[PDB]
């Protein structure tokens, strides 16, 4: 893979500074990646421009352009600003070209490799039941499939901002896409909805999970993330307690309900943001291991490792303050949490080339048979009180 264009751009930030100078590489494989300075010599699809849509604007700043991509079921936007209108032209152009190049090669390849795959549901099929979320480009609502009584989450996006179940992720602890359909003006993703309750609620009612209970949920999270990282080459970047639910049997479900994007007040939950995300530094697989660390700290201590009602002070704590533990935590748990919450992503547990393997080899998870974790052969320490039972 070769560099196709490179140079400085102001990158809009959502957390601290608003506009930050970053040195960006555009590569022929589609990756468009920014760095704090000219970097001196695995790729994540999060940073791909493939199938992007490019738009020019003049607010807030002149000479700004926006890359907009549908990543799985989420519309994400990357906003940028240069000094001259000509500069913008060269960038949007360089980006379109790489992107068209990728579409072209890909279509040619599947045209040539199609194997009698040359073959040829709607709103009314569903009962609305509750808004799960709202955002720039659409909403997420709880629905009941009328024909079956089964409950789903439907993500409803505005089709204009954009313009698949055979391409699902076969991992048990991720949210599966059930159906995907479009209307005259909408694009709709029907995805599983766990009915074991929200882990945030379960944790709240119980005050704390024991180390063995947290170990079970962590193993299942670690397994879902290893899969995202290594099978799909994507970072989740969205790990928080409120995005963890339980299925009927007590196994983890990581939700896929996010819309738009987060971040005086912040438009979401900032207490799980990794340092490098706050600083708009470059980030990779290791941000999800930081979120793991915050989630398991919360499970085993019954409170966040860093909190303040002022997000500014919270941000300071996350970047600067050393982790403190309750007296009742053991050393194996303290070792895992302190390694996952290393502020420098390069020295974080999981931040090396081995990624998830480092975490599964940590002594905290000794004895966990990861093949059995993947196969739901582990026995849940808690069975929610419940199939189509609206208990929660």
């Amino acid at each position, epitope marked *: 893979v070769a560099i196709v264009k490179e140079g400085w751009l102001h990158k809009r930030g959502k957390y601290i500074k608003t506009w930050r100078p970053r040195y960006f590489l555009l590569k022929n494989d589609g990756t468009f990646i920014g760095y704090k300075e000219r970097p001196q010599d695995a790729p994540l699809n999060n940073f791909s421009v493939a199938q992007c849509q490019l738009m020019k604007t003049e607010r807030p700043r002149p000479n700004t352009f926006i890359i907009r991509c549908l990543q799985w079921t989420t519309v994400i936007e990357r906003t940028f600003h240069v000094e001259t209108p000509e500069e913008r032209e060269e960038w949007t152009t360089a980006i379109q070209t790489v992107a068209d190049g990728l579409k072209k090669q890909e*279509e*040619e390849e*599947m*045209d*040539a*490799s*199609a*194997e*009698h*795959t*040359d*073959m*040829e549901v709607t709103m009314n099929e569903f009962e609305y039941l509750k808004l799960l979320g709202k955002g720039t480009f659409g909403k997420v609502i709880l629905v009941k499939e009328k024909a079956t009584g089964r409950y789903y989450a439907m993500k409803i996006l505005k089709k204009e901002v954009i313009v698949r179940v055979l391409q699902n992720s076969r991992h048990p602890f991720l949210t599966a896409l059930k159906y995907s359909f479009q209307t005259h003006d909408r694009l709709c993703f029907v995805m599983e909805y766990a009915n074991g309750g929200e882990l945030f609620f379960h944790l709240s009612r119980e005050r704390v999970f024991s180390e063995d209970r947290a170990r079970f949920y962590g193993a299942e999270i670690v397994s879902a993330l290893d899969y995202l990282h290594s099978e799909k080459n994507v970072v989740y970047r969205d790990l928080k307690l409120e995005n963890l639910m339980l299925d009927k049997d007590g196994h983890i479900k990581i939700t896929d309900f996010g819309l738009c994007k987060e971040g005086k007040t912040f438009c979401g939950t900032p207490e799980y943001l990794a340092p490098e995300v706050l600083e708009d530094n470059d980030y990779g697989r290791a941000v999800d291991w930081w979120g793991l660390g915050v989630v398991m700290y919360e499970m085993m201590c019954g409170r966040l490792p860093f909190y303040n009602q002022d997000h500014e002070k919270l941000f300071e704590l996350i970047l600067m303050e050393e982790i403190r533990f309750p007296r009742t935590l053991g050393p194996e748990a303290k070792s895992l949490l302190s390694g996952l919450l290393k502020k420098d992503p390069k020295q974080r547990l999981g931040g090396g080339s081995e990624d998830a393997k480092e975490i599964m080899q940590h002594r905290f998870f000794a004895g966990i048979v990861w093949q059995h974790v993947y196969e739901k052969k582990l026995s849940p320490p808690f069975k929610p009180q419940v199939e189509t039972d609206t208990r929660y």
Partner: nanobody
Amino acid sequence: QVQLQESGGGLVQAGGSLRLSCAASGIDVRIKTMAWYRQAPGKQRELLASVLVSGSTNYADPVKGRFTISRDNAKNTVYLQMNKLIPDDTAVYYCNTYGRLRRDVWGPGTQVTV
């Protein structure tokens, strides 16, 4: 202009035969799976036959043995030989590539009636 153009339709006495031809201009039939389809007034468009780049053919049951799909690499064209035809064959006939199929792009089609 890149496109596919079907030709060779018309009326024929049942049990007759017909050769439909799909002229790709702007596309390389040699690099693509090509298929033939048909659609009748009240019905959904029906996949009929495919020919992979190797040349491997394949046909759907209603037409197994009666129709043959062939690719003339030299002539950048696909062909569908229609033998021992039936009223239930009456329809508009389209040819297509995988990519155009998934984008719902179609040439003009040619109408056939038994």
